[PDB]
Amino acid sequence: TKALISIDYTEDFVADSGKLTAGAPAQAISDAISKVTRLAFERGDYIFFTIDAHEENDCFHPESKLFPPHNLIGTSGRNLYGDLGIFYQEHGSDSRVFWMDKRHYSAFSGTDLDIRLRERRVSTVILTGVLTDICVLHTAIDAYNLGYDIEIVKPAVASIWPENHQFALGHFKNTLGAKLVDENLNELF
Amino acid sequence: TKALISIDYTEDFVADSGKLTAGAPAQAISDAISKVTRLAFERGDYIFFTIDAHEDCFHPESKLFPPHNLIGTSGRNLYGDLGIFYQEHGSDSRVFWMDKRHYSAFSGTDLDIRLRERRVSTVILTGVLTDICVLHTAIDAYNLGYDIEIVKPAVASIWPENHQFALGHFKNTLGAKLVDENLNELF
Amino acid sequence: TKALISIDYTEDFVADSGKLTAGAPAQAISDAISKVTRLAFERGDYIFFTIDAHEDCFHPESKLFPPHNLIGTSGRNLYGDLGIFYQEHGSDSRVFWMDKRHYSAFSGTDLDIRLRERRVSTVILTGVLTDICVLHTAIDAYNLGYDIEIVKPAVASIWPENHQFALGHFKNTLGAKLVDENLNELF
Amino acid sequence: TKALISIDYTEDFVADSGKLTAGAPAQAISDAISKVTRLAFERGDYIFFTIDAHEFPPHNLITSGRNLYGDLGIFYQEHGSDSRVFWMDKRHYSAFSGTDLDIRLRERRVSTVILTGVLTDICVLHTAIDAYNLGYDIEIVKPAVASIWPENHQFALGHFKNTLGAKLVDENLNELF
Ligand SMILES: [Zn+2]
Numbered sequence: 063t064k065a066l067i068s069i070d071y072t073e074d075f076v077a078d079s080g081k082l083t084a085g086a087p088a089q090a091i092s093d094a095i096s097k098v099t100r101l102a103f104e105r106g107d108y109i110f111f112t113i114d115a116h117e118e119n120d121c122f123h124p125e126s127k128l129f130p131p132h133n134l135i136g137t138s139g140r141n142l143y144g145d146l147g148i149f150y151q152e153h154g155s156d157s158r159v160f161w162m163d164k165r166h167y168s169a170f171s172g173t174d175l176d177i178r179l180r181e182r183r184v185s186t187v188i189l190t191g192v193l194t195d196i197c198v199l200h201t202a203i204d205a206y207n208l209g210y211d212i213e214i215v216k217p218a219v220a221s222i223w224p225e226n227h228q229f230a231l232g233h234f235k236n237t238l239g240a241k242l243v244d245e246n247l248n249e250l251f
Numbered sequence: 252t253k254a255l256i257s258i259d260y261t262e263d264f265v266a267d268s269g270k271l272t273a274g275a276p277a278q279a280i281s282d283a284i285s286k287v288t289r290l291a292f293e294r295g296d297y298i299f300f301t302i303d304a305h306e307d308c309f310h311p312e313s314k315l316f317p318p319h320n321l322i323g324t325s326g327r328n329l330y331g332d333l334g335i336f337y338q339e340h341g342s343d344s345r346v347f348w349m350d351k352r353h354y355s356a357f358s359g360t361d362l363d364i365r366l367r368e369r370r371v372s373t374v375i376l377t378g379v380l381t382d383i384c385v386l387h388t389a390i391d392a393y394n395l396g397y398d399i400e401i402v403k404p405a406v407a408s409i410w411p412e413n414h415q416f417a418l419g420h421f422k423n424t425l426g427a428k429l430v431d432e433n434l435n436e437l438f
Numbered sequence: 439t440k441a442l443i444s445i446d447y448t449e450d451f452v453a454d455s456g457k458l459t460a461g462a463p464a465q466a467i468s469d470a471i472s473k474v475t476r477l478a479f480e481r482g483d484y485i486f487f488t489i490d491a492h493e494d495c496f497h498p499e500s501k502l503f504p505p506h507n508l509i510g511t512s513g514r515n516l517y518g519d520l521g522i523f524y525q526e527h528g529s530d531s532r533v534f535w536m537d538k539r540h541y542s543a544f545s546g547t548d549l550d551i552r553l554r555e556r557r558v559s560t561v562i563l564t565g566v567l568t569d570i571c572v573l574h575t576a577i578d579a580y581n582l583g584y585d586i587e588i589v590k591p592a593v594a595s596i597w598p599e600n601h602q603f604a605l606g607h608f609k610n611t612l613g614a615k616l617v618d619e620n621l622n623e624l625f
Numbered sequence: 626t627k628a629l630i631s632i633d634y635t636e637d638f639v640a641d642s643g644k645l646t647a648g649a650p651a652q653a654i655s656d657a658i659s660k661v662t663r664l665a666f667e668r669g670d671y672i673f674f675t676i677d678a679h680e681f682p683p684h685n686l687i688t689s690g691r692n693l694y695g696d697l698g699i700f701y702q703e704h705g706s707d708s709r710v711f712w713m714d715k716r717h718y719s720a721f722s723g724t725d726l727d728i729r730l731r732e733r734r735v736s737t738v739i740l741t742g743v744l745t746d747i748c749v750l751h752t753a754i755d756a757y758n759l760g761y762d763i764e765i766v767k768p769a770v771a772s773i774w775p776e777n778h779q780f781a782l783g784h785f786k787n788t789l790g791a792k793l794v795d796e797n798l799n800e801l802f
Pocket residue numbers: 114115116125132133
């Protein structure tokens with residue numbers, strides 16, 4: 063079957079007061095991302111929450127010299143934003159729903175995502191979350207190299223910069239040969 | 252720099268009433284494994300506890316082995332003075348706890364990433380079982396280009412003949428260095 | 439449809455005048471290995487010849503083994519009817535030749551990618567040596583989530599003790615299916 | 626030490642008459658790409674030519690579309706057989722995917738890769754992202770990378786610097802500010 067990957071939709075990346083917030087454009091996808099996730103779950107798909115995980119003063123982390131402290135373990139910054147957070151409280155204990163700490167941008171890097179997907183004979187990944195040109199993009203490239211078919215939920219990905227969101231969407235379609243879908247998981251043309 | 256990998260030295264694998272215990276041969280290495288780990292830590296080495304983690308019906312081990320090392324259960328606790336060591340130094344930045352689901356410590360973990368961050372060129376392997384989790388970890392380290400040290404008195408298997416195969420494989424095929432509890436090369 | 443992996447069955451590993459010969463036990467599987475390969479090809483399976491290739495100061499085997507399987511030599515040619523099979527059907531789209539530098543057929547190759555392109559879920563392993571290149575390949579396949587079949591009469595080791603450790607490992611640890619030269623499960 | 630990666634700078638990618646041609650902007654980096662590659666080689670760096678191999682319209686078939694463009698082809702004629710110079714066939718955009726690039730770099734204990742070639746937002750980007758995930762320091766030779774569209778070239782350069790923490794350098798391997 064299929065797997066939906068929910069990438070970094072947390073307080074720190076989304077909320078107005080978030081430590082490394084993408085701001086309004088990330089907040090704007092809240093309805094669509096929660097909708098498509100509940101739909102995927104209802105359709106029997108596996109759901110993988112792949113969430114940035116930082117410790118305070120990790121001098122070996124490549125991001126430590128680029129970005130201010132964010133998504134710290136045990137803080138409110140790692141909480142899922144909007145109805146997605148309600149969904150996790152309701153269905154997080156379900157065997158088809160996973161929470162996965164990550165340290166790189168890509169959901170595959172240093173995680174057991176690929177292993178879990180192959181156990182389940184998953185051939186298609188559906189990507190949602192933030193940021194379109196960073197974590198979503200890295201995850202998409204890693205999925206491409208690992209031979210997965212790729213679906214991108216257009217109204218359920220967001221970037222801080224609209225120009226970067228556009229580059230990423232074009233890259234998904236023209237380079238990765240991915241399928242762009244809406245919040246109802248129907249193909250867009 | 253160097254990293255010591257502590258593989259699956261839990262109650263469920265070592266203790267008498269353990270759900271998938273290796274028994275006496277595993278218990279026999281308790282003194283040596285805690286000594287070598289405390290020494291590695293004192294030498295400024297990074298310490299990685301890589302521990303079997305179970306919940307799931309898609310696991311390959313479900314059709315082979317009985318339930319063991321379940322998340323949250325006391326079966327996942329570290330055996331002997333090694334458990335005491337983790338209580339003391341677990342909070343230190345050089346010591347890590349790492350859940351794994353395959354035999355190899357590298358498979359589906361961020362072990363390689365963490366080692367590369369620290370520019371580690373040599374891994375020091377300890378734990379159980381010599382011919383399973385230790386062997387799988389050693390082969391993955393070999394393919395990832397790490398130099399390998401095996402602490403002979405701090406690895407154990409259920410079957411002595413399998414322990415012997417594994418030791419010979421490490422030396423002759425992987426070009427690993429066999430060392431003692433004092434981290435001195437064995438000849 | 440499945441994939442058969444043919445590991446290192448060359449002159450230098452097998453032939454009496456080979457640079458690193460396994461001797462009689464490797465020569466003994468010559469009939470079974472070419473029969474099972476032809477059977478796999480006939481039923482539509484993909485065939486992957488994964489062959490050791492030496493040219494290099496930074497190679498890990500340089501300090502452990504004498505020069506063998508050198509590029510452009512007769513030593514890299516497939517032994518027996520297996521060499522005849524590649525002469526006949528090497529140009530077929532389902533038959534592949536890939537050079538490897540580690541023991542495992544997966545390490546630094548595009549084997550996983552090629553298998554995933556074809557939606558292969560099961561690999562069938564043949565060749566030499568059972569406790570080295572075959573074992574490393576099997577462990578990599580296991581970690582990559584493949585079902586594994588081992589053709590018992592078409593794998594060989596230098597020592598019978600090592601051959602038996604490896605077979606046991608495949609069956610008891612990896613959950614692999616042991617099959618005969620007709621690709622039927624052995625009991 | 627360091628390794629320079631030379632990505633897909635062939636006739637099909639660069640030349641006027643080649644398939645899937647990038648045209649003028651790709652031709653424009655010819656002087657810089659050969660200059661920086663020679664400098665890296667003279668410094669003792671390892672040189673990896675990672676070249677797409679085929680068997681999008683048909684391009685880079687295993688044919689004349691795989692010869693290295695310009696003075697870089699002359700460099701390879703002079704030093705291609707040196708133990709520090711490699712020719713690597715690839716089937717994905719990334720130079721790491723399905724190759725032994727990571728293995729060869731680890732054997733030599735390389736900590737830093739220097740990326741050159743085409744296209745900045747495709748093969749170069751995919752290679753850089755893989756290098757990041759494999760824990761390498763990254764250098765991008767700005768005047769020795771190119772793409773078809775300037776906006777794509779600028780996105781990729783911004784991504785390297787701001788997201789991956791790459792060092793942007795010039796043709797003399799000096800950091801740019
Ligand atoms: Zn972060």
